[PDB]
Amino acid sequence: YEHATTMPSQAGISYNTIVNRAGYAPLPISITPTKIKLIPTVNLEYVTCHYKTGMDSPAIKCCGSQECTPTYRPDEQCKVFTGVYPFMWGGAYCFCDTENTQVSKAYVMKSDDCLADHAEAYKAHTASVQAFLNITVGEHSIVTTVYVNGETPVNFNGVKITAGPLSTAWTPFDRKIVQYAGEIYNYDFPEYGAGQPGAFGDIQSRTVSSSDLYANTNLVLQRPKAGAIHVPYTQAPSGFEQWKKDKAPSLKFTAPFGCEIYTNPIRAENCAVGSIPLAFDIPDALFTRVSETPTLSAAECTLNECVYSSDFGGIATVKYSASKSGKCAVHVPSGTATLKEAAVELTEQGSATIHFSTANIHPEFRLQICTSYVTCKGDCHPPKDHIVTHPQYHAQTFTAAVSKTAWTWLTSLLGGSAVIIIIGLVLATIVAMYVLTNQKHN
Amino acid sequence: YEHATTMPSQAGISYNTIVNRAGYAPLPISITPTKIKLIPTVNLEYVTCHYKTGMDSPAIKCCGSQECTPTYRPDEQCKVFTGVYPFMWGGAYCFCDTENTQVSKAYVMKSDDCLADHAEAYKAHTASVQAFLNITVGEHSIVTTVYVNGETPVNFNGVKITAGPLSTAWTPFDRKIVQYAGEIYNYDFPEYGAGQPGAFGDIQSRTVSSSDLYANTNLVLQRPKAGAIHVPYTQAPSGFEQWKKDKAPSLKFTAPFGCEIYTNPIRAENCAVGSIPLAFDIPDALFTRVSETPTLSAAECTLNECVYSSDFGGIATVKYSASKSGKCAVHVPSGTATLKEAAVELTEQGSATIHFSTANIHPEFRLQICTSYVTCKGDCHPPKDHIVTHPQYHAQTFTAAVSKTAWTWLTSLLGGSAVIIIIGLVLATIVAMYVLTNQKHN
Amino acid sequence: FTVTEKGWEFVWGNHPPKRFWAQETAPGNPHGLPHEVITHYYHRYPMSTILGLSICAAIATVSVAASTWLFCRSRVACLTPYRLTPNARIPFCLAVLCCAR
């Protein structure tokens, strides 16, 4: 039996329904979503870290001339300095006054702490939604990771459930992503080979153990001080450190719809957006007949408590009579009241006490109990808290809180003016006919 | 300096262009694509293989009764048969006539040859084109893998080249892919848990060593023969073998645009679809002054031979008088005719030979040698081979092969009618004026 | 088989794939004898040639038709007032030109 429904994309809250085959017993279905992930297709480009300007020892020749032999190290600067009279601790190094030669050679390599302290630059596109449902169809419950593409069914007890695709293609993640220290940022990093000095990605190692890194760190060798053996350089500071000093806050704190960004798979959690459709391919064996379930006669519904709070702040009470003692489903077909439980276990002459939730000020819904319909009617009152620490358990219908007094003010001041204009039109018509009757005289 | 150009996506055929800076030397550019890959994002859903119905040994109790103990094996059947009189080689096994009981248990397990003989069922989306170029910009030549998204530049000698994205999102692959033995199939496989017996995917293991397989093979246990210890069973035959028997041919035989499906990773190569835009960021140091290059005076172009074939079938002789002996660029601006070489080395008073290629019967194209512009003009002849084994080196211009005699026939049949109708209209106007003149005397 | 200018490729057995390409050798001669150039551009471009000959014949027919229409109306306009007189003596030069008796 093909049954299609729709579930809102919101974790924690139980979602209840029933299936009414036209001549059989109603089959209750309950789905409570627990954890709804969103895992993009993530593509590593490069990592970066702090650099470490390595320097070779100065090659000194006395009354000679050196040359520049390159090594093709990253950003490998080299320069030959003439007119140098260096000193060691044990006196001067050459005897020649001039024509001595010192060679400075510097290169950029990545830091020793690159392994545990690095930032991963990614690209993300075309995410994949995946929920941890908790389905109960005819008191047979499973807990299964369902995938919410339009296929990939979950099978249990012959029942085939296909939870279709989300109504929205929204993702919190951008086209480019930087991951650093368990937190994830929407940063527009430059491409490989486009890294600029002083900003994020001046070092670009392809992987953590790539052993071939691009480096553009504005390194310039300088002339040594007269009488000293050192290699003086001048370069722009660590762009990774400057990225860490600025760092507009993580996507964990800035994401729309209240998402919960996590790390080891890059994923978002519990983004309250969209809605999941559902397909139920139910076999015919589960449809129990009518007379194998209880069936009421002369039932009546009264409202004990009625507060239009956020949670189950209404209590309806059903006095019933039925010639069996078993459980049967309860359901509200409109979205007027959201019931708490899905079934009520019955005696033969007792009473039932259900808990509902509603946004209405004058609730009038038609409760469906075992196979019948009672009408639960009352008046709800405002709740005592302004602010609660749990979300809403009902749906705000348009014209839900219109408060019959204000229905009377909209009926009188808008329908009464129509009464004024129709009696004016009738009076005008009677006047025109009486003038024509008067001028029938000649 | 931004220089934007567009290259047709086709391997092997060289592409030549020059940058015409208004007061500096022309700068040659030569780009030959070697291998154009096309790689979709590929996601493994399950594997399948031949199966193997595992059987348990029959549990016989002599004059008793047995029960069914489920082992929860895949597609496991357990029927228990009463009224047995089994046999070994050493006579009868039990000694009763009735009330003996035999338990048969069968289950499905994936085959022993699963590792080296199995089909991998993937999902494809969102291709990522990548290209092996060979770039020469002003006798600086590299060979470098490029990524042809609209970024990820290639850097050599200060030139920053970025190959823009493809003008077409065409992929030879469908949404669903099967790999079997180096060959790839657009095949709409059933989802995991949706396998049917006797067809593809009646056995579904999530990975190759997953230790959890889905088996839907229609296994039914039968009743054994009187006086025989065996487990009889009936099941639908293997759907991986039936899929190998069906197997409409691979994607390297049915794909359009000449694509070549390979799988070390799953990719297409050398599809002749679309076109790569290019972006040149040429620095201002490569532009030599005009006066340091050769420059001609009194140059003249004559066509020696001219065949409007598919290869280079035209020889033009350019006689010049050079101010200096050196190599310089030759280029044709239009797609009227495509030259063979990008540079010509000059003497001071020699005559140069260029090889071109045209579709024109009557070509009139303006060559560009070092900085001048000569006008090459002639007539081509039909080739001799009907079918060649190399693709087309030139462009198909609309009205390229009109063969001047047919220009004369079209111009006569299209212009004489207009001449006759305008002299008819002028004659009508003169006749109207002559009537108004002759009626003037009234 | 039909090999076009866009390519063709057969695999025969365990041989490598051979690719073939057609180049422009249409039958006839496009340089004279106008019953030959139509055969050349019909074996060359079949779809274009028929529509081109159709619109050229249509333009020629409509132009000659409207020119003959204007010539006949001009002849009537020149010969009508010289005929509505009861003596009806057209001058000699106009009777030679506009084909009067």
Tokens at A212, concatenated: 């071939």
Contact map slice: B 85-144 vs A, CB within 8 A: 125-126
**Cβ-nearest to C21 among B390, B432, B438:** B390
Distance CA A342, CA A327 (A): 10
Closest to C5 (Cα-Cα) out of C18, C19, C20, C22:
C22
Flag whether residue B361 sits within 8 Å of chain C, measured between CB atoms: yes
Long-range pairs for A186-191 at CB < 8 Å and ≥24 separation? A186/A251, A187/A243, A189/A121, A191/A45, A191/B151, A191/B152, A191/B153
At residue A58, the 3 state secondary structure works out as coil
Q: Is residue A282 a contact partner of residue A159, using CB atoms and an 8 Å limit?
A: yes
- Cα B438 to Cα A347, B426, B431, B435: the distances in Å are 121, 18, 10, 5
Q: Is residue B229 a contact partner of residue B93, using CB atoms and an 8 Å limit?
A: yes
Closest residue, chain B, to A125 (C-alpha): B126
Give the number of C-alpha atoms closer than 13 A to the C-alpha of residue B137, restricted to the C-beta side.
22
Distance CA B339, CA A165 (A): 55
DSSP letter string, C76-100: HHHHSTTTSSSS----HHHHHHTT-
Closest residue, chain B, to C17 (C-alpha): B253
Angle at A41 between CA A150 and CA A191, to 5 degrees: 150
Q: CB-based burial of residue C29 (10 Å sphere; 0-12 exposed, 13-18 middle, 19+ buried)? A: middle
Instruction: Look up residue A229 and give its DSSP letter.
Output: -
CA B298 vs. chain centroid, Å, equals: 48
Query: Cβ contacts of residue A29 below 8 Å, gap of 6+?
Result: A3, A5, A16, A17, A18, A19, A135, A136, A137, A138, A280
Distance CA A132, CA B45 (A): 19
DSSP letter string, B300-316: EEEEEEEB--SS--EEE
Tokens at B31, concatenated: 């780009």
Residue that is written with structure tokens 């014949």 in the block: C57
Rg of chain C's alpha carbons, rounded to an integer? Answer: 29
Distance CA A321, CA A257 (A): 47
Residue that is written with structure tokens 């220009």 in the block: B407
DSSP letter string, A233-300: EE----HHHHHHHH-PPPHHHH-TTS---BTTTTBEE----SEEEEEEE--GGG---STTS--BSS-E
Identify any residues that bridge with C20 across adjacent strands, giving them in sequence order: C8
Closest residue, chain C, to B309 (C-alpha): C23
Q: CB-based burial of residue B259 (10 Å sphere; 0-12 exposed, 13-18 middle, 19+ buried)? A: buried
Tokens at A162, concatenated: 């296909």
Distance CA B373, CA B365 (A): 10
Q: Is residue A140 a contact partner of residue A150, using CB atoms and an 8 Å limit?
A: no
Query: Cβ contacts of residue A285 below 8 Å, gap of 6+?
Result: A158
Distance CA A189, CA B68 (A): 63
Q: CB-based burial of residue A166 (10 Å sphere; 0-12 exposed, 13-18 middle, 19+ buried)? A: buried
Q: Is residue B11 a contact partner of residue B33, using CB atoms and an 8 Å limit?
A: yes
Residue type, A384: K
Distance CA B49, CA B45 (A): 14
Query: Cβ contacts of residue B318 below 8 Å, gap of 6+?
Result: B299, B300, B301, B351, B352, B353, B354, B367, B369, B374
Closest to B174 (Cα-Cα) out of B276, B261, B272, B275:
B261
Residues on chain B touching A126 (C-beta within 8 angstroms): 41, 125-126
Query: Cβ contacts of residue B124 below 8 Å, gap of 6+?
Result: B40, B41, B42, B43, B171, B173, B174, B175, B176, B177, B266
Distance CA C32, CA B406 (A): 8
Query: Cβ contacts of residue A24 below 8 Å, gap of 6+?
Result: A287, A288, A289, A290
Closest to B190 (Cα-Cα) out of B26, B46, B43:
B46
Closest residue, chain C, to B388 (C-alpha): C21
Residues on chain B touching A125 (C-beta within 8 angstroms): 126
Residue type, A378: G
Preferred mutation among B405, B423, B439 to probe C, highest tally of C CBs within 10 A:
B405
CA of C22 vs chain B CAs: smallest distance (Å)? 5
Give the number of C-alpha atoms closer than 13 A to the C-alpha of residue B327, restricted to the C-beta side.
9
- Cα A314 to Cα A9, A181, B255: the distances in Å are 25, 47, 65
Distance CA B431, CA B425 (A): 10
Task: Please tell me which chains touch C, using 3 or more CB pairs under 8 Å as the contact test.
Answer: B
- Torsional sign, CA A195, A201, A203, A206: negative
Closest to B257 (Cα-Cα) out of B129, B178, B171, B167:
B171
CA of B216 vs chain C CAs: smallest distance (Å)? 38
Closest to B158 (Cα-Cα) out of B6, B4, B284, B17:
B284
Distance CA A351, CA A345 (A): 10
Residue that is written with structure tokens 């992987």 in the block: A207
Distance CA B56, CA B61 (A): 15
**Cβ-nearest to B152 among A41, A153, A192:** A192
Q: What is the dihedral of CA B29, B35, B36, B42, to 10 degrees?
A: -150
Flag whether residue A153 sits within 8 Å of chain B, measured between CB atoms: yes
Tokens at B23, concatenated: 């007061």
Q: At what angle do helices B405-438 and C34-44 cross, to 10 degrees?
A: 120
Cβ neighbours around A351 below 10 Å, total: 12
**Cβ-nearest to B193 among A155, A192, A194:** A155
**Cβ-nearest to B125 among A126, A151, A193:** A126
Q: State the resolution, in angstroms.
A: 3.0
Instruction: Look up residue A193 and give its DSSP letter.
Output: T
Query: Cβ contacts of residue B338 below 8 Å, gap of 6+?
Result: B332, B356, B357, B358, B393, B394, B395
Distance CA B235, CA A340 (A): 47
Distance CA A268, CA C93 (A): 102
Q: What's the per-residue H, E or C state across B141-157?
A: EEEEEEECCCCCCEEEC
Residues on chain B touching A201 (C-beta within 8 angstroms): none
Residue type, A90: G
Flag whether residue C25 sits within 8 Å of chain B, measured between CB atoms: yes
Tokens at A185, concatenated: 């940022």
At residue A429, the 3 state secondary structure works out as helix
Tokens at A366, concatenated: 């038609």
- Torsional sign, CA B212, B213, B218, B220: negative
Residue type, C76: V
Backbone angles phi, psi at B110, to 5 degrees: -75, 160
Q: At what angle do helices C46-79 and B405-438 cross, to 10 degrees?
A: 20
Tokens at A134, concatenated: 């908790």
**Cβ-nearest to B153 among A126, A154, A191:** A191
Query: Cβ contacts of residue B252 below 8 Å, gap of 6+?
Result: B183, B184, B259, B260, B261
Distance CA A393, CA A357 (A): 7
Query: Cβ contacts of residue B346 below 8 Å, gap of 6+?
Result: B294, B320, B322, B325, B326, B327, B328, B352, B370
Closest to B277 (Cα-Cα) out of B370, B151, B401:
B151
Q: Is residue B87 a contact partner of residue B227, using CB atoms and an 8 Å limit?
A: yes
At residue A374, the 3 state secondary structure works out as strand
Q: Do β-strands B2-8 and A372-377 pair in parallel, antiparallel, or remain unpaired?
A: unpaired
Residues on chain A touching B153 (C-beta within 8 angstroms): 191, 193-194
CATH assignment, B296-377: 2.60.40.350
Residue that is written with structure tokens 């859903």 in the block: B45
Tokens at B240, concatenated: 């991986």
Distance CA B311, CA B108 (A): 62
Distance CA B345, CA B329 (A): 9
| Experiment used for this model | cryo-EM
Preferred mutation among B13, B387, B393, B411 to probe C, highest tally of C CBs within 10 A:
B387
CA A387 vs. chain centroid, Å, equals: 23
Query: Cβ contacts of residue B211 below 8 Å, gap of 6+?
Result: none
Helix or strand run (H / E) with residue B4? strand B2-8
Contact B310 C23 (CB under 8 A): yes
- Torsional sign, CA B141, B146, B151, B153: negative
At residue B18, the 3 state secondary structure works out as strand
Query: Cβ contacts of residue A79 below 8 Å, gap of 6+?
Result: A68, A103, A104, A221
Q: CB-based burial of residue B20 (10 Å sphere; 0-12 exposed, 13-18 middle, 19+ buried)? A: middle
Closest to A208 (Cα-Cα) out of A131, A291, A118, A148:
A118
Residues on chain B touching A155 (C-beta within 8 angstroms): 193
Flag whether residue B430 sits within 8 Å of chain A, measured between CB atoms: no
Instruction: Look up residue B292 and give its DSSP letter.
Output: G
Helix or strand run (H / E) with residue B36? strand B35-48
Q: CB-based burial of residue C57 (10 Å sphere; 0-12 exposed, 13-18 middle, 19+ buried)? A: exposed
Q: What is the biggest distance separating any 2 CA atoms in chain A, rounded to whole angstroms?
A: 147
Tokens at B89, concatenated: 């080689």
Residues on chain C touching B411 (C-beta within 8 angstroms): none
